[PDB]
């Protein structure tokens, strides 16, 4: 029923070939029943075999293997294609069978001749065709047709048939044909039975070939998504410096799908084009076509690589897996970042300051990176190329730290060319020519300026001579000193423009330098010397061209640049001309004196321009010692010494001058000589150009002797002589000889030698003499004779009074007086006055004594020098000193005084003792007080600012008076404690400076060091002498408002030690008042800041210029037209025109210029109006309300109406200054009209005054001053007026003195009065002398009339003065011919002046005399004034005769008060009786001589001779008969009766001669009758002598009348001196008879004879006129008694002997006594006169007898006889004899002897000796001296130096990040136009500045 039969094949899955005979299997199962059934098998074709039916394993449902154990069922198929195998069932094996069913199975058989192979490159890609599949077919047969192949995806029925795919034709040849197979797509991820059948026919046919993957080569696809990669190799921030490391050990790739899977190649690429891609390398322990190990094995064992990146950027390295050849299936990227921005280069310079080429600059360069430390190369470039090795640098240090290790480098620079220095960094060595790229660069550049060389050129001859001399001297100097250890040598030459041509290149110069013509010089090391080179050239001919070029180069660097001028010189080429002249000033040649010697060098042609000044050197011979350089070597040495000076000229001068001031020590004829040398340096010789022939001290000696007053017994006198020389001693030492000439006694004084070194002028000579104490006082002369060189016998003598004091030694007393008294302060000037007196003081002015006084403190001696002169009058010597005590003594000071006689260079003491001060000396206490306190930065003076540093200033003074200028300054310490403890030091414990004394020295401290601002501060200030003020300034800062304790102390620093407290009471500080402190305003003061470049929209100009002002307004207010108002809602900047009164500069304000100028409306500068203006009108101010337009700042005082601006100042004022701050009234005596530069002086004789009167007023009126200038300038007196007459103004320019206070002192006319003696009219410079006869006086003036011309006699004042000049006259009768004499003198007597105007007093005529008073008034009875009668008086005062004992000479008696005689203003008076005048000349007043009378008048003459006439001028002598023995008698007194005058002109009465008498009955003296006042009753005396009458005579003198002559005596003739007696014999008994009557006869008369006398006795006369009667002869008797007429003889009887006999006649007429005696009786005589009577002779009677006769009667002649009538008759008596005659009378007694002469009177005694003259009166004490004037105050010291700015105001802040507005932030042609506009604007502004500057 059910049969299941399946037929299969037991062969391989691949289809069997035709040569294997594959077997087949049969499977039978019959579940319905089990029964053996035969099976028949049929192959593809039944023609081969049929086989036989055989049994299986009993059929059954279970197969049994069969047909192969013992069965020959081989098919041995021969055909190729498909064969059908048929299985059938039959019940029995014997034919016929039973047909039930058949199974058909196809079997494919192919041929091995065709071979199909596949080649696989790798895994075919999904969704893309892969070329790795290649199919090759090989056929042995030559001929083939086309084949077609069908491909089935799977053997499952789901896959449907595909179309054929073509594989080829192979038309011929048995080659191998290749085709490309399109890939397969993997989707199911499982087993695929993809089968391809290849047919040789398009339709039907047989299975030619088969295709399957066919094992051992299967495609295996790995899905990339399963892959896992982890690399993490290589640094993430590797730069180019480091390296990238790639390690294959850490990189693993795993299949991760199976253990066995085909081998792939890993590949990695660095994707840089420098290094090619790495090739595939054989893996270790692995190969190609090698199975992967079944365990975890690394694809690489230890492979690792390193790489260096040569490029920068983000590298994206690649990883891939490749199969077989270069076939790629996967690509993966690894990002490695390469950055080069981390490299930084820093350059730091340390040394800097590059100078010239030395001091090579060394700086540090550092390369830093953020990370990736690696080796690098640094290079430097300096214009010579970088280092080829690029050095070597290693980043051993870390990259975060700034410092980098490096080697310091230095560079050498030359010239000024750019070296383009740069620094480069590289990551590559560069040896392999792998140059790097720029990373950091950086560099430092500088301009490096070149150096300068100094060149000087000169010409040795200055004139090129042809082949003789052509030398050029060149000096080269190099900048900077050459350092030690390096020597610089420069070689080159100089080419002159004489031969050849200048080089056209520097190569020629280099060749010349290297050639033998070049010269080499060496610079000294460690110094910079001057290179001096002398170049010698040869000149063919003389030329004026001498320029040249030199180029010295060190190797290759030129030294000269075209910018400086090329070297061109002329310097006196060709030597045109050169001439000299010499002069001296002064021309005198004294001894040791300064003289000027000048030399002028001139040329005929002016020096050409462009030539250097002549370098010639002029040397002058001084001639001090006559060391004249005669040789040329000496001249060269003198020129090269200091005595030679180089010469230079100023530009524009052809001429040159050389000057010298030689001195002549010794007198000589030598004169200075000039040498002029300019050849070359190192002078050796001298050259002369020419010369010009010069064609045409005092010693003072004083001496002195010590002691001045010698003292007996003292020391020997010392004579000291000082000699001073006017000339300084510098050449050599001097020797002086002090001598005193020999006087012949006292010894020869010895010479004294004085030696003087350099600089000495005074020589002192000392000698000793012992005997000069015994020298006679007197004016002694001493001399010194000095001979010193040229001067000979310089003899100097002197005189001095030398006296000896005796034994008294003079001494000096010194006392003191002090100006300040007690007490004294510090720095107080003082006056110490010392007075010295001498107790003797005898030589007050005899001999000066040199006195010098020195006052010393307690220095310890016992320029401020003191000069002391000894007073030549009184010996009071005063010394003035100033001690200037200013310091505390600190131990005591003493005062000493020394007085000396030596001029400085003391050896001898003069004061007996050193003076000690009587006044106690007190130590002055110093006082100091603070004067002011100031705070500089402060809002108010009490409060300063906090943050701003403050400088407190304390100003104070040291004592009220300034410390003296002649002193040394003091050092003061100002100490301040700030008060806080902000400094580290704590607050001091003591308020005093106990801590402050320990401060260190603060001399060198900077302000900005935080210790110059310490809390405790000590500062030192200095008081220079003469300064009384000091300010100490303290820097103090206040951090914040709070408490501070700043202590202030001021002390004195002495010897760097702190003194005592300046203030009284210690710990006294003048603390400032307490204050708070407030914040400082941040305000800056300065000019308006100019805005920077800001965008200005349309017209917002921020600068106005040229008289314009910046103004903020929206209006476009052009000019003054009011065009635009409210023209914008927004104001803008505008330029305003400014008003007329203000000028502006660089307009930002419109400030006005000062009052001295006026401006225009828009004036750039203010014009200066001429000096006449101040421009000050009255004020009118400005706008009332802000409604009107504003113009200027509000504070201006004027608006600008009025073209008036310049206001001229009025008259009386002058403005010399151009500015005119104010116009000033000009000084006294000067006037101006309008406004003048200066007033003119007033004219002579004129002064300032008003011009209200007179004319041409100079006053300024009202309109000019009051209206224009207001009341600021009042009217001023401005007229010049001349003073009225009698006054004058000699000095020009004088003005009237005006006093404002008029009540007390009035205004004064300045004109001088023209005082006594001169007169003036109007204004005169000098008042004139006025005509003769006139004078002016200051007491009284005028003329008084002659009192005697008026009846009253009262003087009359007269006003007669000529109108020409006008001086008061002198009174008539007085004259003033003297020039300068004040009071008129009278004329001396002898003249008269009646005329009021008379030059001189006129002489009176000889007939009159100049007597006061007229003759009428002299004897006038008139009484002009009866009450007083003083003017009228009787002044004759004549004398007369008076009766009585008393006598009166004056007629008028009284004291005399008016006797003035010189006064004579009257007419000539009548000549006086006692005076006469004939001739002009009379020396002395002669009254009329006694014996001369002049009658008062002709009619009044009492008696005058008729033979002459009266002239009224001659004094006629007395007439005869009158005498005058007294002067001034009008008439001559007549002689009295007792005298007479008969001879002519007998001057005194002559005694009346005897015998004559003179008596005149009419003889009366003249009587002056008062009733007629006339002399009357004068009668002339007798003219001739009248002799006396008869009988009158007088023999005695002084007889008025002759007495009558005595009776009996007669004077026969008249005029008889004596009355002779009557002649003898004559008598005169009656008087009045002229003849004496003769006596009668017989009578005799004797002399006299009053009566006749009768002759007695007998005597008889008998003669008429008989003198006497003589007796007759004897014997005669008289006739009668008493009457005898004739005697007769007696009678004869009588006789008598007596001659005289008389008889009484009494009887007989004969008797009588003594008569004739009677003869006796008897006797007779008879004869008269006989002898005795004789008797008669006797008779004789016859002769015989004699008888005597007797006479009878008496007298009888006859004799008769007697005896009758005889004698006896009567009585008769006789007579006695007569008595004898009496004796003669005795002689008279002897006469007395004559008296003896009296002794003579004693002789007059000698005069007593005269008394000596009294001594002169004592001289008065000396008058007081003159006071000195004071001194002016010093000028104020200059203001303190201005401090530099402590700190500038806060600067504007810089931008930090930005400054933009608008809500800030929350997180071709146009360029040319802009450039053109900017350049044009800048150049226009520059032009504007340029124009404004000038």
Q: Report whether the peptide linkage leading into residue 1108 is cis, meaning its omega lies within 30 degrees of zero.
A: no
Question: Burial of 357 by CB count in 10 Å (0-12 exposed, 13-18 middle, 19+ buried)?
Answer: middle
Task: Give the pair of three-digit tokens for residue 704.
Answer: 């002195």
- Residues 64 and 1197: their CA atoms lie apart, in Å, by 153
Residue 1703's nearest CA partner among 1660, 1663, 1672, 1658 is: 1658
We report the CATH number of the domain holding residue 19 as: 2.60.40.10
- Residues 1847 and 1007: their CA atoms lie apart, in Å, by 12
DSSP character string of 1354-1365: ---EE----SSS
Residues 332 and 314 in one domain: yes
DSSP, collapsed to helix, strand or coil, labels residue 26 as strand
Number of neighbours of residue 798 by Cβ within 10 angstroms? 13
Across 1184-1200, b (16+ Cβ under 10 Å) vs e yields eeeeeeebbeeebebee
Distances from the Cα of 966 to the Cαs of 460, 1027, 1526, in angstroms? 60, 11, 96
Question: Would 1829 be classed as within a structural domain?
Answer: no
Residues 1477 and 1574 in one domain: yes
Residue 849's nearest CA partner among 862, 858, 840 is: 840
**Up-side HSE of residue 1531: CA atoms within 13 Å toward CB?**
22
Type and span of the H or E element at 659: strand 656-660
Residue 912's nearest CA partner among 933, 897, 930, 894 is: 897
Q: Report whether the peptide linkage leading into residue 1729 is cis, meaning its omega lies within 30 degrees of zero.
A: no
The answer to whether the beta carbons of residues 219 and 124 sit under 8 Å apart is yes
Residue 108's nearest CA partner among 18, 200, 202 is: 18
Question: Would 374 be classed as within a structural domain?
Answer: no
Type and span of the H or E element at 1255: none
Residues 235 and 308 in one domain: yes
Task: Give the pair of three-digit tokens for residue 996.
Answer: 């402050």
- Residues 1891 and 1894: their CA atoms lie apart, in Å, by 6
How many residues are present in the chain?
A: 1894
CA 967 centroid distance within chain: 21
Residue 788's nearest CA partner among 838, 839, 727 is: 727
Q: Enumerate the β-bridge partners of residue 178.
A: 136
The answer to whether the beta carbons of residues 381 and 417 sit under 8 Å apart is no
Residues 247 and 275 in one domain: yes
Residues 83 and 177 in one domain: no
Residue 491's nearest CA partner among 469, 479, 476, 472 is: 476
Determine phi and psi for 1746, rounding to 5 degrees. -120, 130
The answer to whether the beta carbons of residues 1226 and 1171 sit under 8 Å apart is no
The answer to whether the beta carbons of residues 1109 and 1148 sit under 8 Å apart is yes
- Residues 169 and 1814: their CA atoms lie apart, in Å, by 204
DSSP, collapsed to helix, strand or coil, labels residue 1405 as coil
- Give the domain extent around 1511: 1471-1587
β 24-29/4-9 pair status: antiparallel
Question: Would 502 be classed as within a structural domain?
Answer: yes
Question: Would 1308 be classed as within a structural domain?
Answer: no
Final residue of a structural domain among 925, 944, 967: 925
Final residue of a structural domain among 295, 316, 339: 339
Residues 972 and 1021 in one domain: yes
**Up-side HSE of residue 887: CA atoms within 13 Å toward CB?**
15
The answer to whether the beta carbons of residues 1275 and 1260 sit under 8 Å apart is yes
The sign of the torsion formed by the CA atoms of 1027, 1029, 1031, 1032 equals positive
| Number of domains into which the chain is organized | 10
Query: For residue 1656, what is the DSSP state?
Result: P
Distances from the Cα of 1489 to the Cαs of 186, 1476, 1502, 1536, 1550, in angstroms? 218, 11, 19, 22, 19
Final residue of a structural domain among 1421, 1451, 1466: 1466
Residue 377's nearest CA partner among 433, 425, 311 is: 425
- Residues 1206 and 1171: their CA atoms lie apart, in Å, by 10
- Residues 1151 and 605: their CA atoms lie apart, in Å, by 62
Residues 1414 and 1455 in one domain: yes
User: Longest Cα pair distance anywhere in the chain, in angstroms?
Assistant: 384
- Residues 1301 and 1306: their CA atoms lie apart, in Å, by 8
DSSP, collapsed to helix, strand or coil, labels residue 700 as strand
- Residues 156 and 193: their CA atoms lie apart, in Å, by 9
Number of neighbours of residue 518 by Cβ within 10 angstroms? 16
Question: Would 281 be classed as within a structural domain?
Answer: yes
Residue 309's contacts (CB-CB under 8 Å, 6 or more residues apart) are 238, 239, 240, 244, 272, 315, 338
Q: Enumerate the β-bridge partners of residue 1523.
A: 1533
Residue 419's contacts (CB-CB under 8 Å, 6 or more residues apart) are 382, 383, 413
Across 149-169, b (16+ Cβ under 10 Å) vs e yields bebebeeeeeeeeeeeeebee
CA 714 centroid distance within chain: 58
The sign of the torsion formed by the CA atoms of 780, 786, 790, 793 equals positive
Scanning 484-572, the segments in alpha helix (DSSP H) are: 506-514
Question: Burial of 421 by CB count in 10 Å (0-12 exposed, 13-18 middle, 19+ buried)?
Answer: middle
We report the CATH number of the domain holding residue 903 as: 2.60.40
Residues 1055 and 940 in one domain: yes
The answer to whether the beta carbons of residues 911 and 814 sit under 8 Å apart is yes
Residues 1460 and 1488 in one domain: no
HEC states along 716-764?
CEEEEEEEEECCCCCCCCEEEEECCCCCCCCCCCCCEEEEECCCCCEEE
Q: Report whether the peptide linkage leading into residue 114 is cis, meaning its omega lies within 30 degrees of zero.
A: no
Helix, strand, coil percent values for the chain (each to nearest 5) = 5, 25, 70
Distances from the Cα of 683 to the Cαs of 75, 687, 1159, in angstroms? 152, 11, 71
Question: Burial of 1397 by CB count in 10 Å (0-12 exposed, 13-18 middle, 19+ buried)?
Answer: middle
Determine phi and psi for 1885, rounding to 5 degrees. -65, -40
Residues 1476 and 1569 in one domain: yes
Question: Would 358 be classed as within a structural domain?
Answer: no
CA 1861 centroid distance within chain: 66
Residue 1301's contacts (CB-CB under 8 Å, 6 or more residues apart) are none
Question: Would 258 be classed as within a structural domain?
Answer: yes
Question: Would 1823 be classed as within a structural domain?
Answer: no
Residue 1133's nearest CA partner among 1121, 1115, 1107 is: 1115
Type and span of the H or E element at 1438: none
The answer to whether the beta carbons of residues 1104 and 1135 sit under 8 Å apart is yes
HEC states along 201-218?
CCCCCCEEEEECCCCCCC
Residues 91 and 188 in one domain: no
Question: Burial of 986 by CB count in 10 Å (0-12 exposed, 13-18 middle, 19+ buried)?
Answer: exposed
We report the CATH number of the domain holding residue 794 as: 2.60.40.150
The answer to whether the beta carbons of residues 1182 and 1133 sit under 8 Å apart is no
Residues 177 and 232 in one domain: no
Q: What is the resolution of this structure in A?
A: 3.6
- Residues 1235 and 459: their CA atoms lie apart, in Å, by 67
Question: Burial of 1591 by CB count in 10 Å (0-12 exposed, 13-18 middle, 19+ buried)?
Answer: buried
């Amino acid at each position: 029923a059910t049969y299941t039969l399946t037929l299969d094949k037991l062969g391989p899955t691949v289809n069997p070939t035709t040569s294997d005979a594959v077997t087949f299997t049969a499977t039978v199962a019959s579940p319905d029943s089990t029964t053996a059934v035969f099976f028949t098998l049929d192959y593809g074709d039944g023609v081969t075999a049929e086989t036989t039916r055989t049994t299986t394993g009993a059929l059954s449902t279970t197969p049994t293997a069969n047909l192969v154990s013992a069965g020959t069922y081989t098919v041995t198929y021969a055909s190729i294609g498909t064969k059908f195998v048929t299985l059938r069932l039959y019940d029995s094996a014997v034919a016929p069978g039973v047909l039930l069913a058949s199974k058909t199975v196809p079997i494919y058989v192919e041929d091995s001749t065709l071979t199909a192979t596949l080649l696989q490159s790798g895994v075919p890609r999904l969704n893309l065709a892969f070329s790795g599949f290649k199919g090759r077919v090989s056929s042995s047969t030559a001929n083939r047709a086309d084949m077609w192949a069908t491909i089935q995806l799977d053997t499952a029925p789901g896959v449907f048939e595909s179309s054929r795919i073509f594989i080829g034709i192979a038309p011929t040849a048995s080659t191998n044909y290749d085709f490309v197979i399109p890939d397969q797509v993997y989707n199911l991820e499982g087993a695929k039975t993809t089968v391809l059948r290849i047919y040789d026919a398009p339709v039907g046919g047989t299975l030619l070939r088969t295709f399957t993957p066919a094992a051992a080569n299967a495609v295996y696809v790995v899905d990339p998504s399963k892959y896992v990669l982890t690399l993490t190799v290589g640094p993430t921030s590797v730069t180019t410096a480091d390296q990238v490391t790639f390690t294959q050990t850490t990189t693993e790739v795993s299949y991760s799908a199976s253990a066995t899977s085909p081998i792939l190649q890993w590949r990695f690429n660095w994707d840089d084009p420098s290094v090619v891609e790495t090739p595939l390398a054989y893996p270790d322990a692995l190969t190609a076509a090698s199975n992967f190990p079944t365990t975890a094995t690394a694809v690489s064992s230890a492979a690792a690589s390193t790489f260096r990146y040569t490029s920068t950027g983000s590298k994206n390295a690649r990883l891939r897996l490749y199969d077989g050849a270069n076939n790629v299936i996967a690509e993966k990227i690894v990002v490695i970042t390469v950055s080069n921005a981390g490299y930084t280069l820093a350059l730091a310079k340390t040394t800097a300051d590059p100078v010239t080429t030395d001091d090579t600059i060394a700086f540090s360069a550092g390369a830093k990176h953020l990370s990736s430390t690696s080796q690098v190369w640094w290079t430097i470039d300096y214009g010579a190329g970088e280092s080829s090795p690029r050095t070597a640098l290693t980043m051993t240090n870390v990259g975060a730290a700034a410092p980098n290790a490096i080697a310091s480098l230095s560079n050498q620079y030359t010239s000024g060319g750019t070296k383009l220095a740069t620094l480069r960094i590289y990551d590559r060595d560069g040896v392999g020519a792998n140059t790097g790229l720029l990373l950091a660069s950086t560099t430092v550049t500088f301009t490096v300026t070149p150096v300068l060389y100094a060149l000087e050129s000169a010409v040795e001859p200055f004139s090129p001579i042809a082949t003789v001399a052509a030398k050029w001297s060149f000096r080269i100097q190099r900048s900077k000193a050459t350092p030690a250890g390096v020597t610089e040598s420069i070689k080159c030459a100089f080419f002159g423009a004489d031969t050849g041509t200048a080089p056209a290149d520097l190569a020629a110069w280099l060749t010349a330098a290297n050639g033998a013509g070049g010269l080499t010089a060496t610079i000294l090391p460690s110094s910079i010397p001057s290179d001096i080179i002398s170049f010698t050239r040869t000149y063919a001919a003389a030329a004026a061209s001498l320029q040249g070029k030199l180029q010295c180069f060190i190797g290759s660097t030129p030294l000269w640049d075209p910018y400086y001028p090329t070297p061109v010189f002329q310097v006196l080429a060709a030597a045109p001309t050169y001439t000299l002249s010499a002069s001296v000033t002064p021309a005198v040649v004294p001894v040791d004196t300064a003289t000027l010697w000048t030399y002028n060098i001139i040329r005929s042609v002016p020096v050409p321009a462009g030539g250097p000044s002549l370098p010639i050197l002029c040397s002058f011979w001084d001639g001090k010692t006559g060391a004249a350089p005669t040789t040329d070597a000496g001249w060269a040495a003198l020129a090269g010494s200091a005595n030679g000076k180089g010469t230079s000229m100023a530009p524009g001068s052809t001429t040159a001058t050389c000057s010298f001031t030689p001195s002549y020590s010794t007198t000589g004829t030598a004169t200075p000589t000039l040498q002029l040398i300019q050849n070359s340096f190192a002078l050796d010789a001298a050259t002369t150009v020419g010369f010009l022939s010069p064609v045409y001290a005092s010693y003072t000696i004083s001496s002195y002797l010590n002691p001045v007053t010698p003292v007996a017994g003292g020391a020997a006198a010392v004579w000291r002589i000082v000699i001073t020389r006017n000339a300084a001693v510098t050449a050599s030492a001097k020797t002086l000889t002090c001598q005193m000439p020999d006087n012949g006694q006292g010894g020869s004084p010895a010479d004294v030698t004085a030696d003087i070194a350099v600089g000495g002028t005074t020589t002192v000579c000392v000698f000793s003499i012992a005997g000069y104490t015994t020298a006679t006082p007197g004016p002694y002369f001493a001399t010194v004779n000095v001979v010193d060189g040229a001067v000979t016998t310089s003899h100097i003598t002197k005189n001095f009074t030398v006296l000896a004091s005796g034994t008294t030694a003079p001494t000096y007393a010194v006392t003191s007086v002090v100006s300040p008294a007690t007490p004294v302060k510090v720095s107080t000037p003082v006056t110490y006055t010392f007075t010295i007196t001498r107790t003797t003081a005898v030589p007050a002015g005899g001999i000066p004594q040199p006195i010098i006084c020195e006052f010393f403190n307690g220095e310890g001696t016992a320029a401020d020098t003191v000069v002391a002169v000894m007073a030549p009058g009184e010996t009071t010597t005063t010394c003035t000193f100033t001690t200037y005590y200013t310091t505390v003594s600190a131990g005591g000071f003493t005062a000493k005084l020394m007085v000396f006689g030596e001029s400085a260079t003391t050896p001898s003491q003069l004061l007996a003792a050193v003076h000690s001060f009587a006044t106690p000396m007190v130590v002055a206490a110093a006082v100091v007080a603070v004067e002011s306190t100031t705070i500089s930065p402060n809002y108010n003076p009490t409060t300063p600012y906090t943050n701003i540093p403050t400088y407190f200033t304390f100003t104070l003074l040291r004592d009220p008076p300034v410390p003296p200028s002649a002193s040394s300054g003091v050092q003061f310490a100002c100490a301040l404690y700030t008060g806080q403890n902000v400094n580290p030091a704590s607050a001091p414990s003591a308020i005093t400076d106990a801590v402050y004394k320990t401060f260190t020295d603060v001399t060198t401290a900077v302000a900005t060091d935080a210790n110059y601002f310490a809390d405790q501060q000590l500062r030192v200030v200095t008081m220079a002498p003469g300064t009384g003020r000091v300010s100490c300034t303290f820097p103090t800062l206040y951090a914040a408002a709070g408490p501070f304790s700043p202590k202030f102390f001021v002390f004195e620093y002495a010897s760097s030690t702190v003194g005592a407290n300046a203030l009284a009471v210690a710990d006294t500080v003048t603390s400032l008042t307490s204050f708070t402190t407030q914040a400082a305003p941040t305000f800056i003061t300065g000019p308006t800041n100019v805005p920077q470049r800001v965008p200005l929209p349309k017209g917002f100009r921020t600068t106005c210029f040229d008289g314009y002002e910046l103004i903020f307004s929206n209006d476009n207010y052009t000019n003054g037209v009011r065009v635009a108002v409210d023209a914008y809602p927004y104001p803008v900047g505008q330029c305003r025109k400014c008003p007329g009164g203000t000028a502006t500069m660089d307009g930002y304000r419109c400030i006005p210029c000062p009052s001295g100028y006026w401006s225009n409306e828009g004036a750039r500068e203010c014009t200066a109006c001429p000096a006449g203006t101040i421009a000050k009108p009255a004020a009118l101010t400005a706008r009332a309300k802000y409604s009107i337009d504003p113009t200027t700042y509000h504070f201006v005082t004027h608006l600008a109406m009025g073209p008036e601006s310049c206001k001229k100042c009025p008259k009386g004022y002058f403005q010399p200054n151009i500015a005119g701050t104010v116009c000033l009234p000009c000084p006294s005596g000067f006037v101006s009209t309008s406004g003048a530069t200066g007033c003119t002086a007033c004219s002579e004789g004129t002064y300032h005054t008003d011009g209200v009167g007179t004319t041409t007023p100079g006053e300024a009126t009202s309109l000019d001053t009051t209206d224009t200038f207001g009341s600021i300038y009042p009217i001023i007196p401005n007229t010049c007026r001349q003073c009225p007459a009698n006054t004058y103004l000699p000095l020009r320019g004088q003005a009237a003195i005006a006093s404002m206070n008029l009540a007390a002192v009035s205004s004064a006319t300045p004109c001088r009065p023209c005082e006594d003696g001169t007169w003036s009219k109007a204004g005169a410079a000098g008042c004139q002398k006025c005509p003769p006869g006139t004078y002016r006086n200051t007491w009284f003036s005028g003329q008084l009339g002659s009192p005697f011309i008026t009846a009253d006699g009262v003087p009359v004042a007269t006003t007669l003065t000529e109108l020409g000049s006008g001086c008061s006259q002198c009174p008539p009768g007085t004259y003033a011919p003297t020039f300068g004499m004040s009071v008129c003198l009278p004329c001396p007597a002898g003249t008269f002046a009646s005329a009021p105007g008379a030059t001189a007093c006129q002489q009176c005529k000889p007939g009159t005399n100049s007597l006061m008073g007229d003759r009428t008034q002299q004897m006038a009875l008139v009484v002009t004034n009866a009450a007083n009668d003083f003017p009228a008086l009787r002044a004759y005062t004549i004398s007369g005769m008076v009766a009585g004992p008393a006598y009166a000479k004056p007629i008028v008696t009284g004291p005399d008060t008016n006797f003035f005689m010189a006064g004579k203003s009257e007419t000539c008076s009548t000549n006086l009786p006692g005076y006469y005048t004939d001739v002009d000349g009379l020396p002395i007043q002669l009254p009329c001589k006694p014996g001369t009378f002049m009658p008062f008048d002709t009619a009044t003459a009492n008696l005058l001779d008729t033979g002459l006439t009266v002239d009224g001028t001659q004094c006629y002598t007395c007439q005869t008969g009158t005498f005058n023995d007294e002067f001034s008698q009008p008439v001559c007194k007549a002689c009295w009766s007792g005298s007479f005058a008969s001879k002519r002109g007998l001057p005194t009465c002559e005694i009346a001669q005897p015998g004559t008498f003179t008596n005149v009955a009419a003889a009366a003296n003249a009587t002056f009758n008062t009733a007629t006042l006339i002399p009357t009753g004068l009668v002339k005396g007798a003219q001739a002598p009248t002799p006396c009458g008869m009988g009158y005579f007088q023999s005695s003198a002084e007889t008025t009348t002759c007495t009558a002559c005595a009776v009996g005596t007669y004077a026969d003739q008249a005029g008889l001196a004596a009355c002779k007696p009557c002649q003898p014999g004559r008598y005169q008994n009656s008087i009045g008879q002229r003849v004496c009557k003769p006596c009668d006869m017989g009578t005799y008369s004797r002399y006299g004879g009053e009566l006749c006398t009768k002759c007695p006795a007998g005597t008889v006369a008998s003669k008429t006129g008989s003198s006497q009667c003589t007796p007759c002869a004897a014997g005669f008797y008289a006739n009668a008694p008493d009457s005898a007429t004739s005697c007769r003889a007696c009678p004869r009887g009588y006789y008598g002997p007596y001659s005289g006999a008389y008889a009484d006649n009494l009887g007989d007429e004969f008797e009588g006594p003594r008569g004739c005696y009677k003869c006796p009786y008897d006797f007779f005589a008879d004869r008269p006169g006989v002898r005795q009577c004789t008797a008669c002779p006797p008779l004789d009677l016859g002769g015989g007898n004699l008888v005597e006769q007797c006479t009878e009667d008496l007298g009888s002649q006859r004799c008769k006889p007697c005896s009758l009538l005889s004698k006896p008759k009567t009585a008769r008596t006789e007579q006695s004899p007569p008595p004898p005659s009496p004796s003669p009378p005795p002689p008279p007694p002897p006469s007395p002897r004559p008296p003896s002469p009296n002794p003579p009177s004693p002789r007059p005694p000698s005069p007593a000796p005269p008394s000596p003259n009294p001594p002169p009166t004592s001289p008065p004490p000396s008058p007081p001296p003159s006071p000195p004037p004071p001194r002016p105050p010093p000028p104020p010291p200059p203001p303190p130096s201005p401090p530099p700015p402590n700190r500038s105001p806060p600067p504007p802040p810089p931008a930090s990040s930005a400054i933009n507005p608008g809500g800030g932030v929350n997180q071709i042609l146009s360029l040319m136009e802009d450039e053109d506009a900017e350049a044009a604007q800048e150049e226009q502004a520059i032009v504007d500045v340029d124009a404004e500057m000038q």
